[PDB]
Amino acid sequence: VSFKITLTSDPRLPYKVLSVPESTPFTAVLKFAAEEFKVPAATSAIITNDGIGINPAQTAGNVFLKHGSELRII
């Protein structure tokens, strides 16, 4: 599965596209995205477009199924 993750704290709203196995934990996606954007992995969070936090203790496939592939990192 491909996630498009947008960093909102940079006003240009850069995004990265990440390819992740469905059964990989979403914790890994949060970590990778944080690394890609050079933001601290331990304080960062992935949210929906309404600002709701995604609990990363679930598979990437589950997150895609429930909330789609376009998310934001804060």
Residue numbers in the entry: 4 to 77
The authors write:
The modification of proteins by ubiquitin-fold modifier 1 (UFM1) is implicated in many human diseases. Prior to conjugation, UFM1 undergoes activation by its cognate activating enzyme, UBA5. UBA5 is a non-canonical E1 activating enzyme that possesses an adenylation domain but lacks a distinct cysteine domain. Binding of UBA5 to UFM1 is mediated via an amino acid sequence, known as the UFM1-interacting sequence (UIS), located outside the adenylation domain that is required for UFM1 activation.
We determined the crystal structure of UFM1 alone at 2 Å resolution. The crystals contained two molecules of UFM1 in the P212121 asymmetric unit with RMSD of 0.14 Å. Superposition of this structure with the UIS fused to the UFM1 structure did not show significant conformational changes (RMSD of 0.49 Å). Unexpectedly however, we found that the interaction between the two UFM1 molecules in the asymmetric unit mimics the UIS binding. Specifically, the spatial position of Ile 55 and His 70 of UFM1 overlaps with that of UIS residues Ile 343 and His 336, respectively, which are involved in binding to UFM1. In addition His 70 of one UFM1 molecule, similar to His 336 of the UIS, enters a negatively charged pocket on the surface of the other UFM1 molecule and interacts with Glu 38 & 39. Using gel filtration we have found that UFM1 exists not only as monomer but also as dimer. However, in the case of the E38A mutation that prevents interaction with His 70, the dimeric form is not seen, suggesting that the dimeric interaction is mediated via His 70. To address this question we superimposed the structure of the UFM1 dimer on our previous structure of the UFM1-UBA5 complex. As shown Fig. 5D, binding of UIS to the UFM1 dimer positions the dimer in an orientation where one of the UFM1 molecules within the dimer clashes with the adenylation domain, thereby preventing activation of UFM1 dimer by UBA5.
